[PDB]
Structures are given as structure tokens and as C-alpha cells.
């Protein structure tokens, strides 16, 4: 890409979600969603290889179908109420269709199959964008209509997302697929508390982003797209092992780290609302994630996998890739539990 194209596509990517978050009109929220969908595809298919094209096509077809369902809901609400916004009197089926289509856009189970494949097929920075920035626009619409959503539908989607993410992450040797399934699990947690307290959904989104962006940056540091590839960190870049371990454990949700606070506060609010069974099931199944993160920690930081002869030439060279943002975000994602009351 040349500078004009880079500017004009990154501006569209940034503008889509901004328009959705700022719009009062459901049609303009849909316009923002379309902006995101159209602007991201060239960056997905930028490298031009069969996997890139396949990922781009899958993403496009899925997201276009979801956008059409959302537009159907918007148009039916317009027909019913003569207004371009969901009201308290909007029809339950219209709201259910909107919820299902937006969950398809997000990637919540069982509408999750496309997400790990599209994540696998694209470069790491594009995966970072897709799993962080592209989640804001669909979630904003839901957060605007949180008094109207169906708790039964949302909790079924949430528990299904937790179970499917936890089970998917176990079987994966691919780092991008593991990131995708982590995204599915955390989105299940985010959606579990939407009908009750969307402030906690925003908190979980923020902590998830602050954890995921550094993980993708660390992956990009050496293009470690596999467990065996990341295992060579002790030789290629030893200094990142401690922060990678802590970030993975925080994603898992071990208490002392910041990643605990979302699960803890969400369980608290669900219990306050008398959602004991679902809260217990979610907190119980969120341990498979700790397992398949601890496997990564074993392979990367707590052991030493075999290395190659050529990695000495790697050692010879000088590197300048880690930004100032990695340290900031990693520290904020791991060592911020003491400041818990401020976050909520």
C-alpha cells in the first residue's frame, strides 16, 4: 500500500466504529458497521495468498449476512414504531434478531466458527486489529439497548461461548487460533453481564484489550505463530519471558493479576442478580483456559525447548521492534489489581 491508500483505509477503519458509537440513528450505526466491514477487507487480503483470500472471503460473507439481518431488524422496528431507534415497545423478536446478528458479527458461539479461521489466515497485526478494534462497534449497539435484551438468549450465548472457547483452545497448536478462542471466551464473559451491568462489560472489554494487544505485539516481535516457534523465546528474546508468563496468567484469570478483576466482579454482579447456576458454570469452565495457558507457559518460560544452530546468527543481530507501548500495557494488564476500586 502507498501512503494515500494507507491513510484513506485506516481513516475508514477508525471512522466506522466512531460513527457507530456517536450515531443516534440505527441506520447510521449500520452505516458505521458497513464502513468497518468494507475497509478492513483490503488489509486482510493485503498479502495475497490463498489463505489470505480464503479468510477475506469467509469474513466478508459472514459479516455481510449479519449486517443484512441487523438491517432487517432496524427496518422492521421502523415499520412498527415510525422511529429509527429501538424503544421499550419494540418487538421481542426484532430485538432477538438484532442480538443474534450482532453476536454473529462479534463471533460469540455458536456463531463462532468463522472467527478462528479468519484469525489464522491473516497476519498478526491484522488479527490484533480484528480482535480488538472491530469488537467495539457491535458491542456499542448492544450496550445502548441493554434494558431491552433477552436474558435467556444472552445467557445461553454466553455459556455456549465460554464452553466452546475453553474446549477449542485446548486442541490448538496455533497461536492465532488460540488468540481467537481466547477472544471467544472473553466475549462470552462480556456478554454474560450485558443485560445486568454494561459498565462491567466495558471493564471486561478494556482489560481484555489491554491484555490482548501486548500478547499480539510479543507474538509479532518474532512472528511466533506456533507453540514450537514461541518456545525459542528463551534463545531469541529472553527478556520477554516474564511478561509473557504474567500476561498469559492474567488472561487465564489467576487472582493476584489484573485479569482476575473482570471475572470476580462479573460473578459478584451475577450473584447479586441471583444468577448462581450460570455464574458457577462460567467460573468453573473458565479453568480450561488456565490449563491451555499454563501449557504455553511450560513451553515458553518454565522449560527450555531445543533450539537451532542458526539462532546464533539471530543472537548476533540488533533488534529495535518493541515499542514503548508494550511495557506500559503489560504492566497495566498485570500489576493493577490493587487499584481495583478505581477501575469499577
Amino acid at each position: 500500500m502507498n501512503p494515500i491508500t494507507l491513510a484513506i483505509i485506516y481513516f475508514t477503519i477508525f471512522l466506522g466504529p466512531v460513527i457507530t458509537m456517536s450515531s443516534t440513528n440505527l441506520m447510521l450505526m449500520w452505516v458505521g458497521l458497513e464502513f468497518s466491514l468494507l475497509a478492513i477487507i483490503p488489509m486482510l487480503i493485503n498479502k495475497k495468498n490463498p489463505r489470505s483470500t480464503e479468510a477475506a472471503t469467509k469474513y466478508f460473507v459472514t459479516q455481510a449476512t449479519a449486517s443484512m439481518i441487523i438491517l432487517l431488524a432496524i427496518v422492521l422496528n421502523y415499520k412498527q414504531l415510525g422511529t429509527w431507534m429501538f424503544q421499550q415497545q419494540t418487538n421481542g423478536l426484532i430485538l432477538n434478531m438484532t442480538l443474534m446478528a450482532l453476536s454473529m458479527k462479534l463471533g460469540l458461539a455458536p456463531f463462532h466458527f468463522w472467527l478462528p479461521e479468519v484469525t489464522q489466515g491473516i497476519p498478526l497485526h491484522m488479527g490484533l486489529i480484528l480482535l480488538t478494534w472491530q469488537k467495539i462497534a457491535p458491542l456499542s449497539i448492544l450496550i445502548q439497548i441493554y434494558p431491552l435484551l433477552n436474558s435467556t438468549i444472552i445467557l445461553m450465548l454466553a455459556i455456549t461461548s465460554i464452553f466452546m472457547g475453553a474446549w477449542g483452545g485446548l486442541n490448538q497448536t496455533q497461536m492465532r487460533k488460540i488468540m481467537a478462542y481466547s477472544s471467544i471466551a472473553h466475549m462470552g464473559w462480556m456478554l454474560a453481564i450485558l443485560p445486568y451491568n454494561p459498565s462491567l462489560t466495558l471493564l471486561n472489554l478494556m482489560i481484555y484489550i489491554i491484555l490482548t494487544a501486548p500478547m499480539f505485539m510479543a507474538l509479532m516481535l518474532n512472528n511466533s505463530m506456533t507453540i514450537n516457534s514461541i518456545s525459542l523465546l528463551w534463545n531469541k528474546t529472553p527478556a520477554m519471558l516474564t511478561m509473557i508468563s504474567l500476561m498469559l496468567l492474567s488472561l487465564g484469570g489467576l487472582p493476584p493479576l489484573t485479569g482476575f478483576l473482570p471475572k470476580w466482579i462479573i460473578i459478584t454482579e451475577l450473584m447479586k442478580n441471583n444468577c448462581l447456576i450460570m455464574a458457577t458454570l462460567m467460573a468453573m469452565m473458565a479453568l480450561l483456559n488456565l490449563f491451555f495457558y499454563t501449557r504455553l507457559i511450560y513451553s515458553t518460560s518454565l522449560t527450555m525447548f531445543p533450539t537451532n544452530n542458526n539462532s546464533k546468527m539471530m543472537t548476533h543481530q540488533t533488534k529495535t521492534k518493541p515499542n514503548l507501548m508494550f511495557s506500559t500495557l503489560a504492566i497495566m494488564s498485570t500489576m493493577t489489581l490493587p487499584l481495583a476500586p478505581q477501575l469499577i
Partner: protein
Amino acid sequence: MLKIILPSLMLLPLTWLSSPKKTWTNVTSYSFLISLTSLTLLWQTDENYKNFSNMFSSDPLSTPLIILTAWLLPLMLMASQNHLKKDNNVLQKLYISMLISLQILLIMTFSATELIMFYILFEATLIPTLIIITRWGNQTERLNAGIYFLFYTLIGSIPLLIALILIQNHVGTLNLMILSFTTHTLDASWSNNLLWLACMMAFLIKMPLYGVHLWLPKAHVEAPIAGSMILAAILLKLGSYGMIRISIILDPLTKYMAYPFILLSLWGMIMTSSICLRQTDLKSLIAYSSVSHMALVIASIMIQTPWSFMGATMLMIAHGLTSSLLFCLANSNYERIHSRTMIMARGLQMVFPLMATWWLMASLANLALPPSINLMGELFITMSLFSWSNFTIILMGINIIITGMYSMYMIITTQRGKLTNHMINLQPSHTRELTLMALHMIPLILLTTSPKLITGLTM
């Protein structure tokens, strides 16, 4: 309490800023001084427990465990000075940091006033322990041992978190003093039974209970010497302490919900004392002896009497010292012959006359020789269980006989017989190792002299 906590934190910058030659000396000396400072908790001249702030407190149950935790860290640092002899200086400092961070977290846990803070710290202690076991073990099974140790705890801990959230929603607070003073009876509903189970399961697994103890022999066999030391000494007592604290709000359900676990502990103590008779690994033998001993603590805490609580506390402290001493003794031979098989080394008293004296003292404490605090705790637990039911004495006597048998069998196999002459590498005992054993034994003798310190809340 901050006067104990903060210097413990400052140990870490001391470790990372000290020169490579003086790091061990400085850290060990200042850990000893912090252990001395922690003795200010013993100045209780009234029945009003110490409450330093809204966040920390100290009772007769917490103070012994806090002092033991403060005391152990110098001993762990000393024990770790040989098998970390070859590692890089950064790696040695990382190990020291893990041990110091474990000390800080355990002291905070035992001084905690709220159950939720207790939970956060009691589960934060896992990360340093997993790191120590997996990153510094010697065998390929350390990874699976760490997985077991982590998930046995996590599975039981999640229900504990759910129960604590439920209690806070119902009552409005988790402060232990408020809960104790405003405690009310629990209706015997099925939901309340499930609450009882959720409150007790995490601690029972940590103890461990007889059915869910498989994670402990693995961890002890695969862990380094400091890992085994801290584990057996304090990480098992976390469960007993939590049970004692949280049982105050679960009455009267205990009276009928304790039967399954009282029975499990009473039978499993025999079933593990028996395994100790035919365990080939010395570390495994010590671990199973620990399981059998902790069965007594579980049973006494379950039956809940003034005698049972005091006996449980005394046995907690005595086992904390004695099991650590036994692990250090075993590691002394391991660092020389590089095998945990007990039959491999024999007649070692012919070449280590004084190490054999330490072996004998540790074994006598293990089998509970009067007037040792081991026997104080065991005898008072036995009396409380006898009052409970007069047929518990049968199981207690069987366990006593088996304990004597396996304790003396360890000595007869290792320190006695004909020397395994083919072992040319049996170097003379290190002054460091002898000092380690002496520091394990002297506090035991002094506490035997003055047992009033290690009685619990009840007496």
C-alpha cells in the same frame, strides 16, 4: 503488621541490587532479622486479639503461623544454596525473589482480616509455588506434578469464591470479626448443605483430604528442597487455618455434615501410614506421612472442641517443623547420591555420625516422643476424638503403631546396617546442612519447653 510486611518487600530490591558475591549473605541475614521482628506478635497480655487496622490482625492462631513463615525463609535460602550453585546469577536472584514473594504473600494471608482478601492471597501463593516446582525441578514429571497441584486447588477454590460472594451478598460484609459476632444459625436446607460443601472443599483439598491427596506426593517428589519445605510447612496449613476461620459461620450444619470427612480422614490416616511402610521413595514416604498426620488435623477441626482446636494448632506447628526437617535430611543424601530410593543408601551412620543424630531426633519427633509438642497435639486430638466416640481409639491406636513402625523403619534402612561401600561420593556433612538441621530442631525443643505459645484460640 506493616512493620513486618514492608521489610519483607525491601528484601527483594536488596536481592536485585546486592553484588553477586554478597547477595546470599545479605538476604539471609535480613530474613533472619525479619524473623526476629515477627516475635513482637507474641506480646499479648490480654484476651483482646491484636487489630492493627481495617486490613490486618493477629490472634493466637495466626501468630504462630506468621512466626513460622517468617522463620522458614532463612532456612529455605540456606537449603537452596547448593543445588543452585551452578545457575546463573540472574537465575539465583529469581529463585530468591520467588521465595521472598512467597513469604510476603503467606504473612499477608495469615494476617488478613477479610475472607475475600484471604482468598486472593491464598490463591496468589500458587504462582510462586508453580514457578519454583516447574522451573527448578530435576525430573520430567515436574510439569505434570505442577499441573496437578494447580488444578486440584483451582477446582476446589472456585466454589469457595462463589460461597464467599454469596455470604457477602447475604450479610453485607466478609470481615471475620463481624461475621463471628453476628453469626446466626443455618437452616438445614439442601442449598445450605451445598454452601457448607462449597465453603469447606477448597480447604479440604489443600489439607489434603484422603480422597484428593494425589497431588501432594507428586509435588513433593518433583519439587526442589525449598519447594518441599514451604509446601509441607505452610501451604498445607493454609487449609486448616481457613477451615478453622470459616467454620464459625457454618454451624450447626457441621454436626451432621462432618461425618463423611471425619470418616475419610480417620480411615485415610491409616491407609497412608500403611503406604509409608512400603514406599520406595524417601520423599514419597515423608509426603504420605504428612498426609496421614494432616488427617488428624482435619478430623479434630471437624469435630470442633476446645481440645480439638488446640491439638490441631499444636500439631500444625509441630508438623510444620518436623516434616521440613525430614525433607532437609532426605535432600542431604540426595545431593550426594542423586537418588531418592531409600534402599540405595544404607549404613550412613558409619560415615555421618551427627547427621544420624539429626535423623534420630527428626524420626522421634515424627513418631511423637513425649513431651514433644507433636505428642501434645496428637494426644489432645486423640482425647477429643475419644470423647466424640469411644471407638475412634481403635483407629488411633492402629495409626500409632503404624507410625512407630514406619518411622523406625526409615532410620533402620537408611542410617543403620552395613555401609553401601561403593558410594565414594559421600562427602562429609556440610556445616550449612548441619546448621539447617539445628535450626529446624532448636525451635521444636524450645516450643516443647513453652507450649503455651502454640495453643490456638480455644486455650
